[PDB]
Symmetry: C4
Subunit: 388 residues, 4 copies
């Protein structure tokens, strides 16, 4: 039986710690993969942590980062949520330097994108084998979520980008059923930029909160229906959630336009909560450091700056990275609704830190019906390592 | 089908060795987690060893114990009983520096407590995901068993503490059904102190034998019914079972009062045997060393000092630690009754020993119908290690 | 239920990357077996990577290659496709310095050949145990595919050789049902030489494209029917696919005769595509380096040199090795046809490279309905290693 | 459903190599347990290799053999046949310095014996938990097979010894059903000595071929019926199969008496083959080196020295050790009969070799319907190791 995921997303008051894998700590001595872009996604039986290795291990000569962010050795693998991304526990998924995965109730789907910059190949797997391919249509680093995709009535949905890092690119959503792409849509968004979407199911549609890497310190929101009609705009809330971003007191929300006058960004998430929203961001507006989650009243519908909750997960003295959304299935929680959860990546090493390598660890939070007190579940690795 | 666990506890004449994981020995070269508080608990299919890592490994720089007894890196994981708590065999359970786990016949429940001292969060998991949360209610190191909890008719029971280490604190029991707390009770015990309970099912109720960390060299007994009425007092037997404790010939039992004029303690267990009892304690009254089990006649009901059996499991030249209770399910043993078993932790390293780290190994004994001869299944690691 | 595999092979326009295990890279620090001859084969549930260890690990003193290409320590093991051939993930199959494996829909069959050169023993396993034996019939290095065998209606088929490396030998096919050899045929091929066949099912027969190690720069084709009648000849296409081979513009195809005036070779594959063919070969005509796949029009039936597609998988600056064929089952793909896939081995170390050891890694491609752009998924290990 | 194992043992013409785990080779760099006494036994699904660790690893300081042959750290564990006895693949069975295991069709039974020399405890496990205990009855190193026990109609049978190494001891057989000892028999054998039996099912009875450690260079045979009546005597064949033993031309068989004038021995096996026998022995009469198997005509019933087959498995330049018997179940082979198989242990290290440690590897042979050529599948580890 295929997962419905047509339930409303639960309205959540705080987030409880789910897991912490301590990858880098363990990887000081154990045999753990160098990774980046480690997202969480769930089947009806288990939550798995997916990650992109660089085909090398921590504390090995091959972790040296003379290589490309995309390389031939990179692969998408997985472990049960909470395990480190270690060699001996790892499930191979796809060849990939960008990916998305998600379970339809019967099987894992997975899409790893690899090949050259000018002509990337994304390969859909299903049941553990290649079932379909989507080639670069715009010739410039075909790419996708680096977080969970989203399946609704046994059909699966994901967002990809192809084009410039730093100016107008091109954006499609895809629709798959059992590893066969049965539909796509070209997403009109001129002046806006979309990458790395964080998507989750809500009341029968896919909702995404993505990264604008061109002009905007606010994140695009893309809401896609089963049949592929969509709405695109920006996160309405009167707070900024990208980094780098400006001050809060320097910032006016927009439902329709990137605001703030900066490039770059980072991947992140957020959850529609009726008309409200929970929105993650780094505590530093200049760096990938600290992580907070902010609940804003009416922030999904209006340029509100009514904050009603804030909850810190990583302190501003400690590294963070990417963050992304996912939901717990009803077959696991037995609820009326879909439980929202996020992961945070905690990037360690060069250039920030004086090592030859760069990796990432993670912690996973989930929505609960009781507020939850601040703390920091940071990465905690003592750098530099022996190989350095 | 949910486990009944309404059977009487079997009356046992001695204990047979079940397992020995040799964690520290193996961890001299293999990749094994630094741990403490490793308890045993069983499902209808298997017995698992749960433990709290410190997010580091043996013989790695991160085992250095500049960290807190509670830290952000600590997690609850598990392995099949008898496996070392090694990276590659480990099942992630919860983020935790204190925990309890137990199986209801369908799934594992688990509760890991983490967060700051002033405002801890305990998160109930069920089927491998967060299902509920109980925040610190008294603001001072929310905490629980570090041994198996107890499920009876698909409902699960555990004891937590919140408050001072060394004076009056506050004590609640909780009742869960499929990871949802459906009931709690505030345990009146003025002048007495309760932590780290060792609990097991017996004739339809939970029985616990706990740690008093304030005034008492005798252990509290808490017996809790399905509907959460309870009895609380002290282990009646005319022997002391905490450490530090006084002499035996200096000691008068009490059913109602801590006796002996000392603080601190250690976690331990014991089994009601009709009106008799089996009671573990360290052989040293001053240190966490050696381990014995003593059967006392009428010791559960009267301040008896009629010892009828004694069985040594670790010699007084060798380190011990915590001990705790659990039962074998009827689906595994095919008996009329619930088989009592205990584990013992064998704590190695600083401050006792000259190393940077501190860990724990374990051995597991179970009740059998034949007396069993003394011996020592001590930890056996040659210290100090290379990292030292 | 036994697999049919009576479907036609799908007509494929390009090949998508399936996996990359990065064995040697990972094996720089992780505990990975030294191997050679790593082929892929699939069951109705999963694709597995099989390989022949040399009973030693990477970066260990025992990888020193004073040993024989065939030795007593060599064994056939397996891992899920994409895992490195690491100790802790490895499934033991057979004792072997040559092997073939394949799934009949119920169980894995496997045949490992071991023993002395003059009197080898090949042992058929089935369900994970020895079920039958075929001894050397010609006294000179009994041997077989080093790739997947082929089961059709619950019956399994494989090709072996016994005789000289470099002159006329002797060639049998075998037919097994549930690990019991129920039929064999002596393959008349005077002047031709056959080793290491790459075989796959197509329209109810086994098709193979093999290695001639005596006179021929073209590969033999052997097509075997259920009842063991066969056709044998050479790959008709007007391109050469062995190495070492001559120039393309120096080369005339033959359906019936080895052409090109050289010894040695390498194992490789190819796919009948109606009357066309896909044919792998190394890009270097002198060395085991680079890997391409070429589609030739009418190349299965005529000495065509009409190339219609070419796709590079490993660049001519990088090592390759063996290649072999396999198909995805219908129980996995849900197609009308059998999906063709190949693996490539990427041999590293001595004598080519200045190390004491020699190993192999792999990448796996599969047939898809969209052309696919060139790139190189080479092995990427920085040599020499520490043990060197 | 419980296994019958009431079929006659198959009449076998040679033995084919089944597995080779290369434990010591792999253990030079990988994390593998120091072990001794590694036997094979099978369930309806799989063959497992059981072994007794010394709670330490290869190439670790703890492999130093200042310890006892029996120690507190020793444990019985298992791996799938062919895997090395490595930490990360190992299944914990029992605490043990002597053991026996065997599957009844539903579950594994296992008996590990531990505790002091003067008062050993043997603990029966079943389904992965302690179910029963047999204490030392004669006060002198209670002990058992170190090979597979034997279950017939869901009932299980094993032989133990208690008493002197080197003079008259005492010998019982036990009968278990689902981990509960339901019967035992005291085995009258005055002047004879019995240890370490190698037992297998045949035509509804247990047959064993054991070790006499007192006076006899011939092995005792014990045949035990379901209801525990038994026959005991010696291997009739006119060849000797213990080591140390005398010359063959110096030796007269006996059905009833130890012959040859020596102490010590080694564990080994043999198979009734109608009236004939296959009998293993070391090739050296003075040392644990080389291994052969000999088929003797009428050798089970008469003091025959008609040898009809011989097959070498390990050469006389290479170390051997213990050997033992087991059968493949009908649920795996689909035969009319029970397939005989043996394992051989290949003991490496001190005192023989200049190291601090001592371990064992293994190879497994099985009976097949075709003669099989000589060779040597010896252990192949280059000694001494780094820790030495
Ligand atoms: C890390 O790698 C550094 C740069 O290496 C050089 O450039 C790369 C692209 C390769 O071509 C490499 O083979 C070249 O040597 C080295 O300078 C440095 O030694 C490395 N450090 C360590 C610790 O391995
Ligand atoms: C163990 O750690 C000792 C104390 O470290 C110092 O204090 C802690 C809290 C950290 O701030 C650490 O970074 C500081 O240096 C060290 O003195 C000692 O070097 C360590 N020993 C080993 C073997 O790693
Ligand atoms: C690799 O092995 C080389 C050759 O070893 C010699 O010949 C082989 C067949 C054995 O008999 C071996 O024991 C002999 O010493 C050695 O010369 C060399 O030391 C080895 N290198 C390493 C790094 O182990
Ligand atoms: C191996 O062990 C040798 C003997 O050790 C001594 O006696 C044993 C029973 C223990 O008491 C031990 O602690 C004593 O030192 C040592 O002489 C030797 O150093 C050891 N060798 C290695 C390589 O560890
Ligand atoms: C395909 C690709 O390389 N994606 C990048 C991503 C990218 O640079 C920007 O979004 C520009 O398009 O940035 C980052 C990043 O840390 O910012 C990591 C991702 N790395 C990987 N997914 N491997
Ligand atoms: C929550 C907490 O830190 N619990 C402690 C416990 C505690 O110090 C006393 O019981 C005072 O309340 O003591 C000990 C101890 O060894 O005595 C270990 C436990 N460590 C862990 N559970 N991590
Ligand atoms: C049985 C055997 O040793 N087969 C060889 C094979 C062989 O040398 C030629 O085909 C001549 O018959 O060559 C090669 C090779 O790389 O060319 C590897 C194979 N190695 C292994 N299969 N182990
Ligand atoms: C219980 C015990 O220690 N059994 C011994 C066994 C024993 O010395 C003789 O049979 C005398 O009774 O000998 C040997 C041996 O190699 O000869 C190994 C066994 N070691 C272990 N099973 N651990
Ligand atoms: Ca931006
Ligand atoms: Ca106390
Ligand atoms: Ca050739
Ligand atoms: Ca003898």
């Amino acid at each position: 039986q295929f997962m419905q995921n047509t339930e409303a997303l639960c309205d959540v008051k705080g987030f409880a710690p789910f897991s912490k894998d301590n990858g880098i700590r363990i990887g000081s001595r154990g045999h753990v993969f160098v990774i980046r872009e480690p997202f969480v996604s769930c089947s009806p039986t288990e939550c798995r942590t997916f990650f992109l290795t660089q085909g090398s291990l921590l504390n090995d000569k091959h972790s040296n980062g003379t290589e490309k962010d995309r390389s031939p050795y990179r692969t998408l693998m997985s472990v049960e949520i909470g395990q480190s991304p270690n060699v001996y526990q790892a499930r191979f998924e796809a060849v990939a330097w960008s990916a998305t995965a998600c379970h339809d109730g019967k099987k894992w789907m997975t899409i790893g994108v690899t090949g050259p910059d000018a002509k990337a190949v994304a390969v859909v797997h299903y049941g553990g084998i290649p079932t379909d391919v989507i080639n670069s249509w715009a010739g410039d680093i075909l790419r996708t979520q680096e977080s969970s995709c989203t399946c609704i009535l046994g059909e699966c949905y994901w967002v990809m980008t192809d084009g410039p890092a730093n100016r107008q690119a091109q954006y499609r959503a895809f629709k798959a059923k059992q590893g066969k792409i049965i539909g796509q849509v070209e997403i009109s968004f001129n002046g806006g930029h979309i990458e790395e979407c964080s998507c989750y199911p809500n009341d029968g549609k896919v909702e995404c909160v993505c990264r604008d890497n061109w002009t905007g310190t606010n994140r695009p929101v893309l809401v896609i229906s089963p049949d592929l009609s969509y709405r695109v705009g920006y996160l309405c809330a009167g707070l900024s959630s990208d980094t780098p971003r400006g001050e809060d007191s320097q910032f006016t929300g927009s439902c329709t336009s990137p605001v703030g006058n900066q490039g770059y960004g980072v991947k992140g998430f957020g959850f529609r909560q009726g008309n409200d929203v929970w929105m993650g961001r780094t505590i530093s507006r200049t760096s990938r450091s600290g992580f907070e989650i902010l609940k804003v009243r009416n922030g999904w519908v209006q340029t509100s700056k009514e904050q009603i909750k804030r909850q810190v997960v990583v302190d501003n003295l400690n590294r963070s990275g990417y963050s992304g959304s996912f939901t717990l299935p009803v077959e696991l929680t037995k609820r009326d609704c879909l439980v929202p959860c996020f992961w945070v990546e905690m990037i360690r090493g060069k250039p920030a830190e004086k090592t030859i390598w760069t990796s990432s660890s993670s912690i996973v939070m989930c929505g609960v019906d009781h507020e939850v007190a601040d703390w920091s579940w940071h990465d905690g690795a003592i750098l530099p390592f022996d190989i350095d």
